[PDB]
Amino acid sequence: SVKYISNMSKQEKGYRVYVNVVNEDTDKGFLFPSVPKEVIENDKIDELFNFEHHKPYVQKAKSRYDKNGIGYKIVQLDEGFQKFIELNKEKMKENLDY
Amino acid sequence: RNYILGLDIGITSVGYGIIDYETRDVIDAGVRLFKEANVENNEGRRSKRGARRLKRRRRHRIQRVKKLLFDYNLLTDHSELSGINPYEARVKGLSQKLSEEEFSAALLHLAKRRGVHNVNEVEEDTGNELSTKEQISRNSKALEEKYVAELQLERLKKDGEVRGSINRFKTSDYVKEAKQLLKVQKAYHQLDQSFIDTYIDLLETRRTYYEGPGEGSPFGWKDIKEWYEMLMGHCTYFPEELRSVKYAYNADLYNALNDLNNLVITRDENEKLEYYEKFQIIENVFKQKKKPTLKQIAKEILVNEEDIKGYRVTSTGKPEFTNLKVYHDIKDITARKEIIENAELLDQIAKILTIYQSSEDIQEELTNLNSELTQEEIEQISNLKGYTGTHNLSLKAINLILDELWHTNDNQIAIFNRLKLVPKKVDLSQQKEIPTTLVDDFILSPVVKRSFIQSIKVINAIIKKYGLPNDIIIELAREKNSKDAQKMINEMQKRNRQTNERIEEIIRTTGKENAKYLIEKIKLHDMQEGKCLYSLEAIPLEDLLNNPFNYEVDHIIPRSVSFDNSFNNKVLVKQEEASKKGNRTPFQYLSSSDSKISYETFKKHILNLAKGKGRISKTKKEYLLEERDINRFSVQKDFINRNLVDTRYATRGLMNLLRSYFRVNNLDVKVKSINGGFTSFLRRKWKFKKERNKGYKHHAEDALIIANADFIFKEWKKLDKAPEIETEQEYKEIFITPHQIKHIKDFKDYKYSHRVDKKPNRELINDTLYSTRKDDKGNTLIVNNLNGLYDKDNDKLKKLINKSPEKLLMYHHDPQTYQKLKLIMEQYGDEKNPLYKYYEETGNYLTKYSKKDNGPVIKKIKYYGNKLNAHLDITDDYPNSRNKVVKLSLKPYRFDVYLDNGVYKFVTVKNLDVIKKENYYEVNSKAYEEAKKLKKISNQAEFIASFYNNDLIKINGELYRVIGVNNDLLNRIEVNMIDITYREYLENMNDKRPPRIIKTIASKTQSIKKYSTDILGNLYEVKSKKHPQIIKK
DNA sequence: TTGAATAG
DNA sequence: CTATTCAAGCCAAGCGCACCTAATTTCC
RNA sequence: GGAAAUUAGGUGCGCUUGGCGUUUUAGUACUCUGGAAACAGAAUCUACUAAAACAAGGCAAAAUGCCGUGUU
């Protein structure tokens, strides 16, 4: 299984983070409405799934995971949140997410 | 035994479910069924009443001109007016002498068609369409150097016609022409000024809305005072007092003092305004400025604007204060203090300005006050504008509490509280059952009103049969009626012309069943400004019409959690956006990697549309930006507890009626209501099948579900008087118990009650007039018309010509024109309408054959229709008519079944045969006996029964409900089934038979019996009288 | 939806 | 009788009051 | 939940009008016959204009006259 950071949005109460958990069959999407800055700024990946999330949304696994439908480039969870922000900062500004 | 009653109140039905309180077993269930009380029925009545008045009054106008002409010997009974063209006479009379006959013909033509009087101030840019405003404007520019008759005669000579949509003019233009005509003809004929004033009077006068009809009318009134006072409402706190007029002086002073007493001032002294500051604000701001501002209040008590809170506010945000309307209107005319500071006089002026509706009646009644007003002031007061409507309180209430508004800071509700004054409550004491009359006050819609009356009668019959229930639980239907339904088939848009000419063609092509969905997507398309709300991409109207199944209506919050099926939960989006969304909220969907826009972009676009005029709803915004996890059980129970109330006005009124009734007569019945979608919500989670065209029983099923709903909400509250998953499992467990579900599914003693209609003087006959012809065999045939000859989808003329060309009258008379028509049919035979293809390819309409090609356009074609049997002969109204003139479709009142020598027969009573006497109706005995002789019903025959619409008839052992006499001559009657419509009965069998049940009462009829039901569906056989009833009250 | 005529 | 066929008055313009909804302020 | 106010919108009851629409009769145009032509006859199809009737019908009696398809 591979965990991807698919979507992020800077809020006043931390950030909103969407993670896709993908195997060969299924895509399980986790919506984290509020993960704090102390986790996002310091790439503490191993704490992410402690935080409250919505029930995972199950759908068929996609053929590729390069970019989302908004245009952000999808980053593996192991690479960290700062890689996602660094690659997608300008487009996040365009879409009111930064 | 103790029971719980559930009701499903619908547009056409009242379902009742009676189940046991302890066992939860179904005791009884059934449906009471009735016609929809659609407003179009009364609309049609009052439309036809209005059309009769116009026709009577135009005839009376013509006859009064005709009497004027007799009195001045301009007309005799020997006067010959036949060959006079009145356009030519009207034109020539404007500058030369007319003969007496020409002059009379011109005046009578002017009197008959005299124009509009009220459009005349309004003028529009021409958009080239069927509006009378636009046509009045086009004609007003065409008359800048011409009289009406001159323009009409140019149209007659150039275009060959005058009459039609083009022919709409102002009365004032006819009057101009009539004065020029009379100015010339008075030099050549012996008339006087009284002739001219009387004729011009007849030409231009009509009644006003506030005069109403002449003496003796049940719809009329004797004066403007009576008219207005019967229309106006009563005071909230003194229900025998009429409301104050809206702009009475003391009413606006009352409003101003309420506005001031609700202020809170941020300052070292008192938070609230003291008396003398209110005096100074009234006298120096409200009596000096027409529209007072916050800056002027703040300057008068020497604080700044931000030290003042509590003021009413406009939607723009600007502060709003009571305007003193009569004060400033009378002040601009007159600043004398013996007028302007007489509060009683200003109240009287405002009353007169509001009740009376014309300047001259204002002046007369203001003059009758005998005030110190000058005549020149009264003439200026009489032309003030805006004096319309009522205040919700009487002057008694206002003048009662005005002193305490001055010298306390209490507002009106606190003062009426301290005085122990309460709004009126209707007494319900000496009543053995719930009366239907308290429905009449509070309800507005006629559909809901009939449903409520039937619901009350059902409850009264249930209490009468089974005793008092412990719980009555009610659901009212929602989500449209079939009336406003048709108003979207009529209204269709705001930007009417260029778009609605093509949706009208798409909607008319489209069948009536699967076409409400498309108009709802149009409604949502217009409120979303043509944007898919999940992608913010444009939706083309044209693509929405050609490809409607490419755009889906998505529920914002899913039905699995929301149970809301209104416009506040539905949006129009692309098919792929609704597919990718799935079972999610917009927040969950747009935050994923499946979206094309971000949630923040979505939230900004929604919050900007949340503002403004015609804004999106607050509950729509709350659904769209729901951020909670709807899969969590606390959120789901929040959606259930929040949206189960049924907040609607009609429901609150019915609940107050029922709770008041049980409270007053010491009956302990708990009455509750649940919202619309909720029962379908429960069936979506109890696995009740989608196909429910299995009859009217689904209404009683829903009522049974409604009754068990009560159990779910009691056992929840004992659960909430209290290890998380186990508790969720107990809420969800008792919510889902299928024990009663199979108990309802196996129920099979549903009862049905169809409401019987016995009203006389309904529609007698169809309006359309038909001519007739005799063939060689002496048969009389009806002549029918083909019109819309050039409409694109009209294949009627093609099918007629290919099947039976000899039916066209043209075929026999004028065969050369027929040949032209046949040639077009040959040439464009593969098209649906060949004359449309001819018009499209050639630009011309089919003309009558002439050798110089100057034949008139053909626009309708007569053909020989069916043989004439049932009819009303009206030929006597048409003197020297060569053929019969008829009307058709003799609407039947009832049939009376007889048994004559072992053969069943019947007499039809037509609505035409039921004659209004003094205070009742009487079956015509001469028509009845001619019917008996026609049917060969002997005096030895036994009378079996009378059958009205929706009476139950058992024929040869099978029970039906009666529609009506289908065919008197061939002894046929139409019926329908009782538990289902025959249409649905055949569609369940996948049967293609035509969905009408016709029965022939004759020698193959073995048995006829009449049954009946009470309002709950209990069947009993009727013992009929010895004789058919003659009188109906 | 319904009066009611017609072909077979 | 069974199955079919035919067709059924309309739209534009103004006014009075009553009631309802939506938004806003105060209190009960 | 209830009271009052301001604005926008909606519904209903009732009132007042307009121009159509259906039908007959008459005139005119169109078709056919006679005729050099005015015109005459036939046909009653198609159109225009006028006048009249338009839920059957019931009142009333010079009159901005009244009632007749709704609800219970």
Residue numbers in the entry:
A (entry chain E): 3 to 100
B (entry chain A): 3 to 724, 742 to 1052
Paper text:
In order to elucidate the mechanism of SauCas9 inhibition by AcrIIA14, we determined the crystal structure of SauCas9–sgRNA–AcrIIA14ct–dsDNA quaternary complex at 2.22 Å resolution. AcrIIA14ct binds to the SauCas9 complex with a 1:1 stoichiometry partially interacting with the L2 linker and making extensive contacts with the HNH domain, which suggests that this interaction is responsible for SauCas9 inhibition. AcrIIA14ct consists of a single domain composed of a four-stranded β-sheet with four α-helices positioned along one face (β1β2β3α1α2β4α3α4). Close inspection of the interface between AcrIIA14ct and the HNH domain shows that β2, loop α2–β4, loop β4–α3 and C-terminus of AcrIIA14ct make extensive intermolecular hydrogen bond contacts with α4-α5 of the HNH domain and the loop between the HNH domain and the L2 linker. In detail, binding of AcrIIA14ct induces HNH domain and L1 linker to approach the target-guide heteroduplex. As a result, the L1 linker becomes two short α helices, whereas the former helix, together with the HNH domain, become closer to the target-guide heteroduplex. Second, residues Lys485 and Lys489 in the L1 linker interact with the phosphate backbone between the 11th and 12th nucleotides of the sgRNA. In the crystal structure of SauCas9–sgRNA–AcrIIA14ct–dsDNA, the distance between the catalytic center of the HNH domain (D556, H557) and the scissile phosphodiester linkage in the target DNA strand (between the third and fourth nucleotides upstream of the PAM sequence) is ∼33.3 Å. This suggests that, in this structure, SauCas9 is in the precatalytic state.
By targeting a specific genomic sequence complementary to a single guide RNA (sgRNA) and a protospacer adjacent motif (PAM), the HNH domain is primarily responsible for cleaving the complementary strand and the RuvC domain for cleaving non-complementary strands. In this work, we investigated the mechanism by which AcrIIA14, an anti-CRISPR protein from Staphylococcus, inhibits SauCas9 activity. AcrIIA14 consists of an N-terminal HTH domain and a C-terminal domain which has previously been reported to inhibit SauCas9 activity in vivo and in vitro without affecting the binding of SauCas9 protein to sgRNA and target DNA but its specific inhibitory mechanism is still unclear.
